[PDB]
């Protein structure tokens, strides 16, 4: 059985607003596809519209939802029914299905509707899908179509529909129109509207249908149609997946279960989503939603760079460099359309944060020589974005004036500590890119500004705390207090948010020993939290509090790098134990998969890096900290060198939580430099029962 | 570890409107208690307010909800919080909790609120509960109170509150008022209202609190308070449970897992719920909701007799005869208050069905000599209580009435119950008239198709028929199941279908068919359809009452050995010792009793006939206390292999039997089944 068929897209999909096990969806699609496909369980639960445990479905939803917090857009629900019987609404047409016989694979979705006795099969392409419908008793099929957008349907010929649907983007309120073409191999006997939805009656009890969408035009949607039969489309999708999955090759698992790792590989290649199309002459084009006009060039959607810069993109840099460059070209195209580097695309700008963490991808690209052709423009785009004011109020740095004046955002701004620290990291990214381009004045100014994390450190308590305009800390402080000054965490986590200058953070805290004790205390504390900053409990609090990892809130991005900070401490062996145990206890090969929000490849990439044995602690520095690998023998394709790295784990016992030694080829290492990594053939960890350093 | 502590009240509690795994709640209570206690997960999901998988809770709900279809009434949510912080609504006060460390036992509920660092413990009494709250950091406690009813709070002294809450009953719209007394061992610093709820501030970071309710009066609520400390109340609740659970004693499980059976025992003793109280002079009193005045005598709520007559009550008759009589006295008291024998009590009449299946309990009591002192009054109540015009005129309900086939068949059974009770009281004219009427199931049989079908006023069947069609003429099933709803005259049903062979083929076809259904009668899919359709049992829809007896019908067929295989495999495949426990709605002891009977090896196919059909038992050696004879029956299963699906022979003491008569059962010491690999008959 090939790997792709063993991956279950339902991992992470059991969630509610109050508690996340991944907040993923069972996305069927090609890697980075423009549309994904998922069954819809309910439309009464807002963004939480799929439940893998409930054997009910309402149809297949063509979706663009990247998270339940962002929600969906330009989505379309397709519901096969028998022409006879049925019901008078979407809800009253819902059907039980056979969960055990359903297939939930990345490239293949199969469901059997027990009410209608219809077998539905779907396989994706980038811009569309091939779908087979079969009423097993030979009764005629009909198809319902529903959207939250205003949906219009025209019959073009005996076997072809053209759909148009319209809504608005959530934050910019730009008009957003998606066109869809559907073509069947059986005649369409009638179309009509029923209570806002469309009902298409078909001549046969069986049909194969081609579907495709476009954000360009109706004729582009037709062009985007699959040209091949179901099996051929399915094989192509399999090949598209396999091309990327096979950049990792597990030679020997040892004691480890590979199931979770495999699932993470699937999650790694879903985002960002393609948001450009190819015209008749073979050129990339995209809709500029600010003007409603077509512009040349690649473009992508569905990514919050604050999530993905820290784990996902660095991993892309190792294994899919062409894709990596294409993504950066797309983000540069966003800049060319709007004047600003984007923050959270879905499909246009949705970011409410002031921080611009795409800079972390830009700086990382620079330090690893990924996109030399774009380096100049990207730098200029960062600089523009960091200094320019937006008359429309949406983009660039907020409180720039105050930040420039004071060296920090004050309590005039919400979540001022978290955002000040994000700015300080961005400043480092600009400084590094300036330096590499030999712009000395800019490098010097931004390097100095990147030290602004110092402005908020309260040496009396030992934590980062917020200041008012006059520069005073607020008198009532608790390190367990969440929100207000800190985004989805407390001072305990937020204080360690200085990726770009860990040595300086150490000096700032009073030196290596005090820093060491800070880390230990975070690991040893109970997962206490206070709701003061919010006035209610949010899922991120609940996820930490119900877990046995102290204040290491692995459920959310701010704690991702914390275990690796022991590498800079008096106890460098503690990183391995923390990682081995987190990996074993926090992640499960089941529908209740993750410790928190997966966040578009962010958390899966965290897991994968854990398995490789090293981690890009500070994107923008060409360096990796050591953790502890998972498998006896795993190969990873270092695509930039067109060669395999063999990663070996010796004495790989489950009760050995420490690394005795690590050799890059023949050389003993405690940190790995990117250049050395790329020159290496072998990476060999030897484990031990007790610490040896 | 005692049995009671191994029972997890969450079995059956994972559900949604569209799909049931029991539709139970994690009820903490004493057996047949007046109030039960459950954590509340959400108030945005209607009746589906608890989810065992979600580590969130909004407080402890004092509930009277017997099913999500009926909903709740006279309920009260109690929410411990820290006096500092908190939030501005019930929703914004919800807290995560530690699911793994929580206890969900019948007599003991423990949850740790992680947001407030408060450990809550509750143990029930019949009329109240003892509660311990402990803020583990020594921060002061407050307590919120919420209800859908209009809720009023008065502070009686430093440590005592008197609560009053009012609503109306769902169908009759009778006024419904519950009083609650709360007493703490720490001072109440303040009470106030916030956005419709009450906030009680307490002096300490921990307290033990006594709670009790009444439907009589505020002073009766105070009288109902627990008089003892937490441990003592907990021991008493344990003893109350053990007294009933120990009527079954598993000596040797063999290959079988006992976990599900044990859970079913817990479910057996929850309903009906006590709905009467004891005055200062020791007499039973109840609120008559039709008048708003107090009346003497026991009274019970939360039971739909259409569910419970067929399995639960017959089982009660064997093991808890005093309780059995008390329940019947309560139902007679309902008749005395309203003029009608009740159908679905929650807490007053909710039944939409025309059928009066409490007659099945009355007739069964008669045939087993359970309540000789009530026999005359019960008979009179049945006759009084006994649509009607047309039924009397035509011998059936026509399509003028919804679900006419199901209801006609229910009436025919009720007529048999009256006829049997008449005969036993030597009222010959009534016995004769109702015996004849009990044959009315024949009026709807269509010999062309072989199914029961509906008729219009003129007596015609509707021309377009499908046996897979659900609703309209049939309640929550198709003609395939509904046609077999003639408990009281199986031999006649057989003759009516064309004889033993044709009947046999009917049964086989039901077992062999795909679980196809058509939504025609509803216009949408309902959970009962979904449960059948997703299961591998053909048209044997074990998820719902109409199919419960179908496997046992093979006992009357050319293939009497097939019953055992159907039961053994249903029992193994349809029930799971987990939160996703049941194939369908548990229905207040109805489905659990079905399971328990399966385990004993015999079944009360027709309540009102003093007779049990044979199935196939579960354990190597199980004892059951036949309380009427004050002795144990030892049930043995020989060659009890999991791949042996048939009964080679069954001996009641020394006598070979194929059906068991109640009288013989009560005289017996031993019941011995020997299993076989292949059929032997
Ligand atoms: O209100 C804070 C919330 O913000 C949402 O957009 C998401 O980030 C949630 O994960 C988080 O709980
Ligand atoms: O309308 C049918 C529905 O009616 C409710 O009262 C319950 O009996 C459900 O089990 C059922 O699905
Ligand atoms: Ca997150
Ligand atoms: Ca039922």
Author numbering:
A (entry chain B): 2 to 87, 88A, 89 to 694
B (entry chain D): 2 to 87, 88A, 89 to 387, 400 to 694
Please give sentences taken from the publication describing this entry.
The genome of S. pneumoniae contains genes that encode a suite of proteins that are biochemically capable of performing the various concerted steps needed to completely depolymerize and transport all classes of N-glycans found on host glycoconjugates. We also identify a solute binding protein (SBP; NgtS) from an ABC transporter (ABCNG) that binds soluble N-glycans and, through X-ray crystallography, reveal the molecular basis of its interaction with these branched glycans. The identification of an ABC transporter that possesses an SBP, NgtS, that is specific to the recognition of N-glycan fragments suggests that this is likely the convergence point of the complex and high mannose N-glycan processing sides of the N-glycan degradation pathway, with this transporter functioning to import soluble N-glycan fragments into the bacterium.
The final refined model contained four SpGH92 molecules in the asymmetric unit with each monomer comprising two domains: an N-terminal β-sandwich domain and a larger C-terminal (α/α)6 barrel domain, which is a conserved and widespread fold adopted by other GHs from families 8, 15, 37, 48, 63, 65, and 125. Each monomer binds a single metal atom, which on the basis of B-factor analysis after refinement, and coordination geometry, was modeled as a Ca2+ atom. This atom is bound in a relatively deep cavity present at the centre of the (α/α)6 barrel where electron density consistent with a single mannose residue, resulting from the hydrolysis of the α-(1,2)-mannobiose the crystal was soaked in, and a glycerol molecule was also observed. The glycerol molecule was coordinated by the Ca2+ atom as well as additional direct and water mediated hydrogen bonds. The mannose residue packs against the face of the Trp70 sidechain in a classic pyranose ring-aromatic amino acid side chain interaction; additional direct hydrogen bonds are made between amino acid side chains in the active site and the O4 and O3 hydroxyls of the mannose. Furthermore, the mannose present in the SpGH92 complex overlaps with the mannose residue in the +1 subsite of Bt3990 while the glycerol bound in the SpGH92 active site approximates the positions of carbons 2, 3, and 4 in the mannose residue present in the -1 subsite of Bt3990.
